[model samples]
Target: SVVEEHGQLSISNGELVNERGEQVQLKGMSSHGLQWYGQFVNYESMKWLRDDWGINVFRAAMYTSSGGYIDDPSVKEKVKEAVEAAIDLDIYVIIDWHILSDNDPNIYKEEAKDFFDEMSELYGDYPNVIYEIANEPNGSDVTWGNQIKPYAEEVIPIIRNNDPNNIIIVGTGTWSQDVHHAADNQLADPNVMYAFHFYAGTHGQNLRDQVDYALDQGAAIFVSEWGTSAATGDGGVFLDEAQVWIDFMDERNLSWANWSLTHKDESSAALMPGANPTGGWTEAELSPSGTFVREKIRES
Candidate 1:
């Protein structure tokens, strides 16, 4: 229903706009690293999220390290599986080159190029697909201009050569909390957006101010990953703070995806322990953060 209503999404004048040029706010869930929670990213699960949880977009965060794609190439299949599932459901899917523990994306630069190239060629023509080039470029040395910017400058052309116009998302520094840095010196591409992540318990007004400044400078922002928990993905399920973030996103028309859709015993996981991966989840099966996000997505 979301796809049929809006079609492909693009960035227009620092806003996530649909095919008809109307601003759109995509609310949905992202899978934990595909290496571990790949089972929850399938068709049935996504369909349930769409019909019940009211998600319009889904992210397949395929990690590049820690026994991920770079370690075992087979993990790409899990991403492709998600691509097909989203295509079937007529929903938008994000193919994320999830870079976390690896610190900098340059470590797997060549591998990322090849992966995105393959992904673009295979699913480039589909309007339901989006590419998140980097997940989180952390570390103080990995500044926007110094490393992440150059890396994106190199990798993006490859995807553009194939896909041409699918929305390309770039992660900022300090665990994707530095959108203003990216906004100041943004990529000269038309449909590219910068990602700004936040954990309610860990990020507050200071983080929101960064996004505000980025928006003022005309940089499109996408919350590709965020959680109600602290950065650890466990600690606090701060719903009040999460609501503040939600109100901020609503006021700005920023697109976002909740941290994960797994059954892990974490504050961000959408499901409780032993929750089935095949859809049909009842309210009792949802975690606290899960319940909050589901209601929020359905709210507007």
Candidate 2:
């Protein structure tokens, strides 16, 4: 079984290691938002991702705003369904508390505590479950130490109290680009990993340099979300730049998930508009970015 094979995932010497203590890279797709794209997150779709797409991980982006987790509590159940589906497929699943519009995670600190508490209680024993405590803590005022770290300090303990072994992904400042900051003042826990998000058209070598610096400083990095579009999630698909980022990740053995699986009419979306949500997608049903990313993921 995949679960038994992976057993428990951990971070050792800035690398994601399996239960057997060998470094591994997990590549997959991340859902846009449960509010709009929940229909595509069924068991069939997940199984197809594992069987056909060769994805070993899936991420559920439960946004804090924009008609998401906080706006609609039902989104929690939707995320839970995604998690269960991933477990059924024997793939790793990330529960991302997407905090984009809501720049500061501390705003929903208490809610985060409750949410992770429940999740740890329900899926604590499942090796396939990974908790992303905060999605992207943005804003110039939000520093890694002052903002993201403190919030993680509060939320991590809640999950640790129940399930101390599963990997906990923490977001950095500057929309998760400030990996150096996280490395400068990293969490004391050994099983924790920091997130580093990028869009090919926007983030370039400077971002990669930050990742290199962080890794040199012994910070475990995971690119929880990235896209072929610009940083804004719009603009044309930058296949060249996307390839560069992918090569960098492959060289470092870094785990990553593409930005989105939605059918939205955007450059980051993997599916064509009105494409079926049940996983039987052909080339015609994929957007330009979708086609490019699909090939990259497949080759990986």
Candidate 3:
């Protein structure tokens, strides 16, 4: 499962086992490209990931429907192609159900089942591929019992039917930052990995406590997505708080993928990639005040 400079992963002794069953850890960024990268498909961004950044993971989004476009019909092929390219390059790609709000799982259940099944059948054998069953699954209290777990229960089986060994991630209520609040969740199987989202600026202390508890409980966990910005009212200095978690992950041998790469025109993201569009860092990448914060965390 080696992707360029990174190695493949398997689980053993409550840890990830490399192809040789050797314990290994993951350190990387989660570039959101499937949805936004489309705008610059031909650009050298992938190269930047592979060469300069040493990024080995890409958290690709599966938007249900945006503006007027249906996710299944409009984005599948392009996503498939990008995933295939990533696979060829030996990078791990998490096909995430980026259902932004609390959308009905039933509304897209059939489509979701089809998309996952097709993806599993098509690229199930790829060692670097994985699935994030749902993104945040947060909003209201009813969202917890009515939407998140129920939908997870339904889709996990669908995903299981295709590739049982692949890690199927589940997000808890309150933007996945509250898995503790939603314990006793029905996971599809042992291959399940619990996910927690963090925006250090907002939930800095809360995230630290949560991660501490997860580690203490010996829960199988991964920080599937994280980013630095004020979108969450954390004041945009996310990396400052993120570095602490990153150190914990590295120390404990955990895997992670950053929230995004390109900000694009989305409400939450790095706007303007760089001063020159093709230059150093975009607002999302290096928000002047945030660059040193990011660098400190990254250096740790």
Candidate 4:
């Protein structure tokens, strides 16, 4: 059931090859705050990403408490409806294993395992779909590397064995930002491709430089996540310089997806201005300012 091409296998390898067998570049953005969107309950919000943005790939912002954690009949039905809406658009979707810090996959590995297996069984056949085992796994410290592998190695095989060659993306050791370290320091699955997160402002040139080295070594990289802090007047370091870094990726033929598209009440949302009820956008709509950056990807 895995999405297949020339039989070399990819997506699992963070690859998108063209007819010539060269890696085809993938350009898109993540719905980082999708969980806040109430599972695509917001019509205009969901359509915008699919219609206007021409976004082919979507990263799910699923919360254990709000989503898979519940066996409640009502919540499950609503979530199922929302997922069907995504499929209706015929674009790629990633069911993110997000917020691992709050709900450790280890504690509920059994339930967690079933949740992912069920989803994969339902939609594993779609080429445009993928899975991210966890999001920003930094708090676990030294065990981060060792701990993550067990889940990935276990979960990846579940999907891979069932779906043969579907693309399976795994987060890096230190909250997905430590990709450079994974290249130089950690043990990774060759069957799996390495992924990284870029909030360029945090590391800026240092991050760019590291990515450059990785690319030079033929390291496969995917910009799994990125975003900005509109709460700060300066627009954080990343968005201000997003164009430059993106251009670098363009030149190198790398794939990237932005941090978020919608957030209902989260403090770091990129949705409409002050639309969130509680912890929503307090300053201004981060999405509007992001238009410039979004245009770059959209137009690309």
Q: lDDT order of candidates, best first?
A: 1, 2, 3, 4
Off by over 4 Å in 4: 1-14, 18-22, 32-35, 39-44, 65-83, 103-105, 140-145, 184-191, 230-238, 263-268, 274-286
| TM-score between candidate 1 and the true structure | 0.98
On lDDT, the candidate that comes out on top is 1
Candidate 4 per-residue C-alpha lDDT over 78-123 given as tens digits, one digit per residue, 9 for 90 to 100? 3344456556655555666665445344654565567677777776
- For residues 1-300, write the lDDT of model 2, one tens digit per residue: 566687799998989999899998999999998898889888988887777678889999999888887888889998999999988888999999998889999988999999999999999999999899989999999999899999999999999999988999999999999999899999988999999999988859888988999999999999999999998898889989899999999999999999899899889999997688889888898899888877877787
Among all windows of ten consecutive residues in candidate 4, which has the lowest summed lDDT? Answer: 1-10
Q: What count of clashes does model 1 give? A: 0
Q: Please write out the lDDT profile of model 1 over residues 175-199, one tens digit for every residue.
A: 9999988999999999999999999
Q: Report how far residue 154 has shifted in candidate 3, in Å.
A: 2.1
| Pairs with backbone N, CA or C atoms under 3 Å apart (clashes), candidate 2 | none
Candidate 4, residue 192: Cα displacement in angstroms equals: 2.6
User: lDDT (0-100) at residue 204 of candidate 3?
Assistant: 73
Model 1, position 286, has a per-residue lDDT of 93
The clash count for each model shown is: 0, 0, 9, 6
Task: Tell me the spans in candidate 2 whose CA falls farther than 4 Å from its real position.
Answer: none
